[PDB]
Design a protein around this ligand. Structure first.
Ligand code: FES
Length: 141
């Protein structure tokens, strides 16, 4: 009964919806074609953290762009908005130097798939249990 159900029917490309779950923000970004291409252009060897940190798939999965989104098309990036350093809320709308998020508390930059690229945070932003249950609704948890 913890699960919640988020209507994403009105989320347009380039919009992040932020929902509170288990007391913390979940970011649901409908990624732009630029965000998607950028994420898919990164090689695993360039990443600080090569683990997908994704509750929905094998815990040893690589942090490819494809392993960071709910959908094959790569439009739906769902992550905990909780910096893996000390838990501040990363600032989005294509912030920081890697086309993603910037955490101002101690200067962590995350890329367009929420992967850590610069700064003190050790890990990619983790991905919650999340799936579409039809065309318009993501179940979290
Ligand atoms: S809490 Fe995000 S960089 Fe320290």
């Amino acid at each position: 009964l913890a699960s919640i159900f988020v209507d994403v029917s009105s989320v347009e490309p380039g919009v992040q919806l932020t929902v509170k779950f288990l007391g913390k923000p979940i970011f649901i970004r409908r990624r732009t074609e630029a965000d998607i291409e950028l994420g898919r252009s990164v090689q695993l060897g360039q990443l600080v953290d090569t683990n997908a940190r994704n509750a929905n798939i094998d815990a040893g999965a690589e942090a490819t762009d494809q392993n960071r989104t709910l959908d094959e098309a790569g439009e739906w990036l769902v992550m905990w908005g909780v910096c893996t350093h000390l838990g501040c809320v990363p600032i989005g709308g294509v912030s920081g130097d890697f086309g993603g998020w910037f955490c101002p508390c101690h200067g962590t930059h995350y890329d367009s798939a929420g992967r850590i690229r610069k700064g003190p945070a050790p890990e990619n932003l983790p991905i919650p249990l999340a799936k579409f249950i039809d065309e318009t609704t993501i179940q979290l948890g």
